[PDB]
Design an enzyme around this catalytic site. Sequence first.
Site, short mmCIF file in Angstrom:
data_model
loop_
_atom_site.label_atom_id
_atom_site.label_comp_id
_atom_site.label_asym_id
_atom_site.label_seq_id
_atom_site.Cartn_x
_atom_site.Cartn_y
_atom_site.Cartn_z
N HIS A 60 2.59 10.68 7.35
CA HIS A 60 3.62 10.02 6.50
C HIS A 60 3.61 8.51 6.70
O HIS A 60 4.64 7.93 7.03
CB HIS A 60 4.98 10.65 6.78
CG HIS A 60 5.14 11.97 6.12
ND1 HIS A 60 5.07 13.14 6.83
CD2 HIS A 60 5.31 12.30 4.82
CE1 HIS A 60 5.22 14.15 5.98
NE2 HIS A 60 5.42 13.65 4.75
N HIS A 107 8.00 6.08 -1.71
CA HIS A 107 8.69 7.40 -1.72
C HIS A 107 8.95 7.90 -0.30
O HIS A 107 9.79 8.76 -0.14
CB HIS A 107 7.94 8.43 -2.59
CG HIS A 107 6.85 9.15 -1.86
ND1 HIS A 107 5.62 8.59 -1.67
CD2 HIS A 107 6.81 10.37 -1.29
CE1 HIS A 107 4.85 9.44 -0.98
NE2 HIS A 107 5.55 10.55 -0.76
N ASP A 138 2.71 13.85 -4.73
CA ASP A 138 3.08 13.97 -3.30
C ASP A 138 2.14 14.94 -2.60
O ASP A 138 1.80 14.69 -1.40
CB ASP A 138 4.55 14.34 -3.12
CG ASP A 138 5.11 13.95 -1.76
OD1 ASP A 138 4.41 13.22 -1.02
OD2 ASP A 138 6.28 14.33 -1.48
#
Length: 313
Positions: free
Chosen positions: A68, A106, A217
Amino acid sequence: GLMQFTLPVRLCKEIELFHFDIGPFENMWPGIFVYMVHRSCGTSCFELEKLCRFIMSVKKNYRRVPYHNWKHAVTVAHCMYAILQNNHTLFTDLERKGLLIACLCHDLDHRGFSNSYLQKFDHPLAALYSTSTMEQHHFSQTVSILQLEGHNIFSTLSSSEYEQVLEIIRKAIIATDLALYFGNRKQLEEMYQTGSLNLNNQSHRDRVIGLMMTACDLCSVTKLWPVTKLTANDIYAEFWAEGDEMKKLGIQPIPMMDRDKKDEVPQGQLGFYNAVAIPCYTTLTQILPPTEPLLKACRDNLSQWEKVIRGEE
Ligand SMILES: COc1ccc2c(=O)n(C)c3c(C)nc(-c4ccccc4Cl)n3c2c1
Ligand SMILES: [Mg+2]
Ligand SMILES: [Zn+2]
């Protein structure tokens, strides 16, 4: 205004393809994003001085976690670039501006832990945001960076266009909360199949944009097998860290997050491809036919994981 970004020939060609990998050279990623903005949006959408300052402040606010991270941010924005470029006429100017920025932002300030771990830990963000905890944080962080002096890339929009783009970005970012995808996709599936799907209906556009955000994503399941397989290790390195932190709170984690149960990884990926990824790209391909290469790539990777289980790798 006459300053284009230009990539080497191999990147110039491959960047247009859904399965492009942005490469191991971090210092090229800002350039790649700006290239994508110029071709997707125009060389005018943004004052380059402000865009560059915005990009570098976003990069700074991504942490050095295994998955991430800043590379995920740029990867997810590239998949959105490929969707927008293959669906030229379906999206407004404001949507193209908003969705690339939403994708880049995001997962801002992600620590590598799920909403569930924050709740069980009793992290202060879990008190501030009862559902979609990290996603409401990511939107908050996006707004904070937009309000730094010299960072407001939207300043040349009219007041109403500004409210609209921030609202596109908020819904886009909230929609990356995978717990919300299941219902969003069922609803889009029903609307597509009964024939009531209407892209001039804002509530339907919102839903279709949410599914695009899920599709971007998840886009690590849509690369060439060696990228997909080596990214899955980064994903598992976070899952197992979270599993460890669960055991520290005296909770046995689910086997997917337990580093003692690495054997069960290939079967875990089967479940995830069949329950999440395949259905996501199927409904997306039904609504936006030119996104079919993402479903085809995902099926290929499903087959590669089946081969790992059969001991054939
Ligand atoms: C229920 O949460 C899972 C479980 C398994 C996965 C997974 O195996 N893959 C490949 C995945 C990929 C490619 N992006 C994600 C993901 C999407 C949204 C938020 C966090 C993550 Cl990590 N996930 C997953 C998510
Ligand atoms: Mg996220
Ligand atoms: Zn993400």
